[PDB]
Symmetry: C2
Subunit: 125 residues, 2 copies
């Protein structure tokens, strides 16, 4: 695995992000954890692809063009901003607006979000 | 596993951080991944415990009271700041200063750092 990749155990639900890569295959509940590749699930793009808005001193990210649901059983678990060697994560809770604000200096950034039902999604400016 | 925990495979070097918990144990290279509990390694505290400094708009974190080495074989791989539901990480590289600046509004924060040789360390304000 490589740094920044997100893996999930489909049996018990553990989800982890790689901080340091290696050659070993991550395992949980007797099976290889699944790589959650971005933008691969068949889901509404207008509700899952992050929309990046440049603000003074940082970025505002919303999921998505159409506000994604934030219900107990279906919500955006976190929004992450990747810039240079920075990885900022904003965890969310059902009931909150599917958005996040990050104060950072970087012209080029990548925004990612994870939906408990529809998986991993990303956008970039 | 629980959110925020850091695990390492002592065989291949994979290191991951938990985003979503679960009941199954993380395994790699045929053995349980090691839980990297903070401040448990027998190393120089003055070089590993993060020192949190309040600055205008956020916090500056340095590792540690005495600058930790940043050599090819021994360096601080990243500095993380935890506040509310925010998890901000700054990955570093040999040759860089063992410090990181985070712009954030949070009265209570926890700063963590990981040394490739001496493990996981933390401090809080
Ligand atoms: Ca075991
Ligand atoms: Ca992270
Ligand atoms: Fe969804
Ligand atoms: Fe060290
Ligand atoms: Fe599992
Ligand atoms: Fe391994």
């Amino acid at each position: 695995p490589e740094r920044l990749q997100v893996y999930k155990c489909e049996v018990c639900g553990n989800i982890v992000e790689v901080l340091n890569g290696g050659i070993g295959e991550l395992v949980c509940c007797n099976q290889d954890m699944k790589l959650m590749s971005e933008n691969t699930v068949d889901a509404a793009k207008e509700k899952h692809v992050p929309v990046i808005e440049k603000i003074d001193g940082g970025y505002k990210v919303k999921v998505g063009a159409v506000a994604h649901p934030m219900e107990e059983k279906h919500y955006i678990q976190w929004i992450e901003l990747l810039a240079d060697d920075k990885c900022y994560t904003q965890f969310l809770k059902p009931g909150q607006a599917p958005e996040a604000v990050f104060l950072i200096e970087a012209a080029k950034v990548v925004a990612r979000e994870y939906c408990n039902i529809h998986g991993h999604w990303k956008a970039e400016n």
